[PDB]
C-alpha cells in the first residue's frame, strides 16, 4: 500500500540488532521499512513547507520611462546639470556632443549633455529569504495489512483509521511519535537541517510563479535592486541595466527602455527548482531529510488471530511492480472474524515449503461481510513460483515467473545506490542502515572527498563537467606513472558518471 | 545541589548560533517550583542518554517559582550533528543544529 508503483521506493531492513534503522527520506519517492517482527511501514515525505519568509531584493524586470529631459552644455562652462536629476526616480548618464556653430555655442568642439528620463517600474521579481528555522516537513506513512485501494486519493479518513498516519516535523520539534492504535509507536528522530541545505537558497516570486534559487545566483543578476526596505516610492538601485543610451551620429542622445526580461530570466534560470504555493506558508516540492526511525513498540495485532478457512478469490490479477515485488488483491467471503490469511508461495503444488520473502508479513482482515479485500504483496524468488493464498483444498494459486536474475538484482541495486550517492552526496552513506564501522568511516571519507570536490569543481555545469571529464580521462591515460594518471582517470570517471545521473 | 526539577519545558524564542560556534537557548520551564537546576545535553545518539559537546554556562538554573522564568544557555555543539536535551528524561523538547565547521 501507499508506495507500490513509485519506481523510487527502497526496501530497508536491519538484522535484529535493536531498532536503529536511520532511513533517509527523499521527496517524490517513498521508502519502506520491514523487520522480522514489526509490521512493515512505508514513509513518504509528501510536502515541505516554509512558514514565515523575509523580504530581500525585489527586482525590476519590466520598465517604462516617462519624459526625457536633456540639458546640453557648451564646450566651456563645463559639464551639464539638468535640474530633474538629483531625485532617484530618474536615471542619468553623460555623453559628449560636437556642439559647433549653427547650433549655439560659438566655440565648436565637443560639449556635453546629460539626456535622461524617469525610471518607473511594473512587475517586481520579489526575492524572499528563508532560514532553516520555522520550516515544516510533512511526512505521511502507512502500514501494510488491511486497506484495499488505499491508493493515495482519500487520505483523510485513513489518518483517523489505524493504518495510516501523518507526522509533521519542525526543527523546533524533530522528535515525533504518532500513534497507530494496535500497531504501536514509530519514534521518528529526524534531522530538519541537513536535507536541502537551506539558507543558501532564496524563494523567488515572479508573476504568480515561485521557485528556489541559490543566493550567490540571486545577488549577481544585473537588474535594478529594490533593496528590501518598504513603502515609499521605491529607491531603485542600479537602474542602468534596463535603460540604454544610444546617441545619434554625434548629437541628440536618446534612451531605449528595453522591455520585459521575464523570459530572459526564465531561460537564465535553468537549474533552479520550482515551488508550488505561497500563502504565509510557502509550500514546496523536492528536498530530502533523514530520520532515525525507532521501532520500540510495533505490535503486530494479528499474531493472536486465528487463521480463517474459506475460498479466496482475486479481483486484480497479481501485477509486478518495477522492483520485482508483486502486489495482489485477494477478496473473500464465507468465513468471518478478524482472521489471518495464509499468504505463502512455493515452487511445487505438493509441498507447501514457503520460499521467498513476504513483504506484507502478517496480513489481517477487518472481520466484515462479503469480500473483505486486503491487497497484500510478496517478493518471489528469481525463477518460477506459485503464489498460494487459501488454506485447504480450495487454496487459490497463481504461476508467477519473476524473470529477474539474482545477479541482476545486485546490479540494479548497485545502480540505485550509485544514484543515491550521486544525488544525496554524503547522506547515501548512513542510508546503509546501521551505525557500523564502515558507515561512519564511509561518511567521513566521503565527507572530506565531497567537500574537496565541491570546493574545487564548484558547480561545474553539464557540458562543462562532461568536457572536463573527457579531458581528465584523456590525461588519465596519456602519460607517466599510475599515481597521477589513476587519480585523473578517477575524477574524470566521477564527472562523467555524475553526468550519467538523473538526466532522463 | 538545587534538585533536578522535572517539569514542562517550552521555548520562549527560537534558538540561534553565534559566529564563534555557540548556541543560545531560552526556555520557560512553565513554573513548577522554586530555584532549581535545569540540565541540558548535546545528543549525537537518541533523544536522551548520551552527552557530547560542552555546556558553556555552568550550573544553569531557574531562579524563581512562577510561570515563565527565562534562562538563557550558551552551548558548544560538536562539529557534526547534535540535538539539544533539556531536563526531563521523558517530557522535553529537542532540536538539531548541524554545527557546519
Amino acid at each position, epitope marked *: 500500500i501507499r508506495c507500490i508503483g513509485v519506481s523510487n521506493r527502497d526496501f530497508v531492513e536491519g538484522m535484529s540488532g535493536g531498532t536503529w534503522v536511520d532511513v533517509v527520506l527523499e521527496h517524490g519517492g517513498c521508502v519502506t521499512v520491514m523487520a522480522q517482527d514489526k509490521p512493515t511501514v512505508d514513509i513518504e515525505l509528501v510536502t515541505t513547507t516554509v*512558514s*514565515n519568509m523575509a523580504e530581500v531584493r525585489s527586482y525590476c524586470y519590466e520598465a517604462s520611462i516617462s519624459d526625457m529631459a536633456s540639458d546640453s552644455r557648451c564646450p566651456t562652462q563645463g559639464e551639464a546639470y539638468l535640474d530633474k536629476q538629483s531625485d532617484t526616480q530618474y536615471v542619468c548618464k553623460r555623453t559628449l556632443v560636437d556642439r559647433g556653430w549653427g547650433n549655439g555655442c560659438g566655440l565648436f568642439g565637443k560639449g556635453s549633455l546629460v539626456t535622461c528620463a524617469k525610471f518607473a517600474c511594473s512587475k517586481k521579481m520579489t526575492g524572499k529569504s528563508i532560514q532553516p528555522e520555522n520550516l515544516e516537513y510533512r511526512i505521511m506513512l502507512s502500514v501494510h495489512g488491511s486497506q484495499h485501494s488505499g491508493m493515495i486519493v482519500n487520505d483523510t479518513g485513513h489518518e483517523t483509521d489505524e493504518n495510516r498516519a501523518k507526522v509533521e516535523i519542525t526543527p523546533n520539534s524533530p522528535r515525533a511519535e504518532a500513534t497507530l492504535g494496535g500497531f504501536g509507536s514509530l519514534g521518528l528522530d529526524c534531522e530538519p537541517r541537513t536535507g536541502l541545505d537551506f539558507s543558501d537558497l532564496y524563494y523567488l516570486t515572479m508573476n504568480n510563479k515561485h521557485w528556489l534559487v541559490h543566493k550567490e545566483w540571486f545577488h549577481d543578476i544585473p537588474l535594478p535592486w529594490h533593496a528590501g*526596505a*518598504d*513603502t*515609499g*516610492t*521605491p529607491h531603485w538601485n542600479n537602474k542602468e541595466a534596463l535603460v540604454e543610451f544610444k546617441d545619434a551620429h554625434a548629437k541628440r542622445q536618446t534612451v531605449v527602455v528595453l522591455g520585459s526580461q521575464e523570459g530572459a530570466v526564465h531561460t537564465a534560470l535553468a537549474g533552479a527548482l520550482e515551488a508550488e504555493m505561497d*500563502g*504565509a*506558508k510557502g509550500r514546496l516540492s523536492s528536498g530530502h531529510l533523514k530520520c532515525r526511525l525507532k521501532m520500540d513498540k510495533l505490535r503486530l495485532k494479528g499474531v493472536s488471530y486465528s487463521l480463517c478457512t474459506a475460498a479466496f478469490t482475486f479481483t486484480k490479477i497479481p501485477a509486478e511492480t518495477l522492483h520485482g515485488t508483486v502486489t495482489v488483491e485477494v477478496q473473500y467471503a464465507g468465513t468471518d472474524g478478524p482472521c489471518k490469511v495464509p499468504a505463502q508461495m512455493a515452487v511445487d503444488m505438493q509441498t507447501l515449503t514457503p520460499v521467498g520473502r513476504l513483504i506484507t508479513a502478517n496480513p489481517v482482515i477487518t472481520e466484515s461481510t462479503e469480500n473483505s479485500k486486503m491487497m497484500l504483496e510478496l517478493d518471489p524468488p528469481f525463477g518460477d513460483s506459485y503464489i498460494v493464498i487459501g488454506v485447504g483444498e480450495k487454496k487459490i494459486t497463481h504461476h508467477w515467473h519473476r524473470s529477474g536474475s539474482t545477479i541482476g538484482k545486485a546490479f540494479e541495486a548497485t545502480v540505485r545506490g550509485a544514484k543515491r550517492m550521486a544525488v544525496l552526496g554524503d547522506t547515501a552513506w548512513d542510508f546503509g542502515s546501521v551505525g557500523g564501522a564502515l558507515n561512519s568511516l564511509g561518511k567521513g571519507i566521503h565527507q572530506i572527498f565531497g567537500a574537496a570536490f565541491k570546493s574545487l569543481f564548484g558547480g561545474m555545469s553539464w557540458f562543462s563537467q562532461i568536457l572536463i571529464g573527457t579531458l581528465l580521462m584523456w590525461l588519465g591515460l596519456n602519460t607517466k606513472n599510475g599515481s597521477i594518471s589513476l587519480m585523473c582517470l578517477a575524477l574524470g570517471g566521477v564527472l562523467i558518471f555524475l553526468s550519467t545521473a538523473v538526466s532522463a | 545541589s538545587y534538585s533536578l526539577c522535572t517539569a514542562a519545558f517550552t521555548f*520562549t*524564542k*527560537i534558538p540561534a548560533e553565534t559566529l564563534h560556534g555557540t548556541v543560545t537557548v531560552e526556555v520557560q520551564y512553565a513554573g513548577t517550583d522554586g530555584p532549581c537546576k535545569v540540565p541540558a545535553q548535546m545528543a549525537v545518539d537518541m533523544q536522551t542518554l548520551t552527552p557530547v559537546g560542552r555546556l558553556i554556562t555552568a550550573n544553569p538554573v531557574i531562579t524563581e517559582s512562577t510561570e515563565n522564568s527565562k534562562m538563557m544557555l550558551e552551548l558548544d555543539p560538536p562539529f557534526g550533528d547534535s540535538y539539544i536535551v533539556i531536563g526531563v528524561g521523558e517530557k522535553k523538547i529537542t532540536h538539531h543544529w548541524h554545527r557546519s565547521g
Partner: antibody
Amino acid sequence: EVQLVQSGPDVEKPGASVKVSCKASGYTFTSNYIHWVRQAPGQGLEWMGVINPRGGSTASAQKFQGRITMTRDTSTSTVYMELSSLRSDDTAVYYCARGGRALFYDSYTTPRDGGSWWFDPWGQGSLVTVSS
Amino acid sequence: DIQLTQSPSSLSASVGDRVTFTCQASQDIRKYLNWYQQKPGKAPKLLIYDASNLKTGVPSRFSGSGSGTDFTFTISSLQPEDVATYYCQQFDDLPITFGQGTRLQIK
C-alpha cells in the same frame, strides 16, 4: 506618566500634504517604536506605518507606498507624520502608539511583544479632514 | 494581507452576562493577537496582549484564549462601563491587520 500627545485637528485641501505631530512623555523617547494607525469614521482601524524614534527608520503599509513619510525629532522627543497626495478618502482620525520592543532599528516581530504592544500612549486622535 | 475576520459584527446583552468574541486569521498567527476595547472618540480601556494575558490595571472580568488561528475573547460579567467597540489585532509579518470591530449595547 507614559503618554503620547498629538496636535489638533487639521483641515486640508485635496492634493496637499498634512503633518501630524506625536510628542512623548514619561519614558525614554528612543526606546519605543511609534506606530501610526488611521481610522475612518465608519471603517475600523487601519495601520498606516511605523517609525523608530532612534535613527528615524520607517516602514509602512502597501496602501500608502510613496504617500507617507515619517520624521523624528530627538531633541523635542516628537514624531512627525507627513501624508502627501491627500484624497477625500484620507478624512480620518490618526493615532500613534509605541510598539515597545525597539532595541536597535525598525519593526521587530519574531522577538517578544505585548504590554502596550502599542495599546497605551495613543495621544488623542488627530482628526484630519480633507475637503475644500 | 493576513485577513483577520472578527465575529460577530455587534452584540447586546444585559448587565452581568458572559459574552465571547471570535477572531479567525486566514494565516497562522501562533499566539500573536491582541485585544482592544475602544470607547467612541475616547482614550480606550485595555483588554489583552499576546491573546491570553491580562495587563496590570485591567479588571479580571476579561480573558482571552486561542491556540492555532481561532481566538476567543470572553467577558465573564458585563458591566455598564464595558460598552465599547471591540477589536483584535494581528502581530505577524507586517501589514498589521485589525478586525472590523464588535460593538455592544446596554439592555
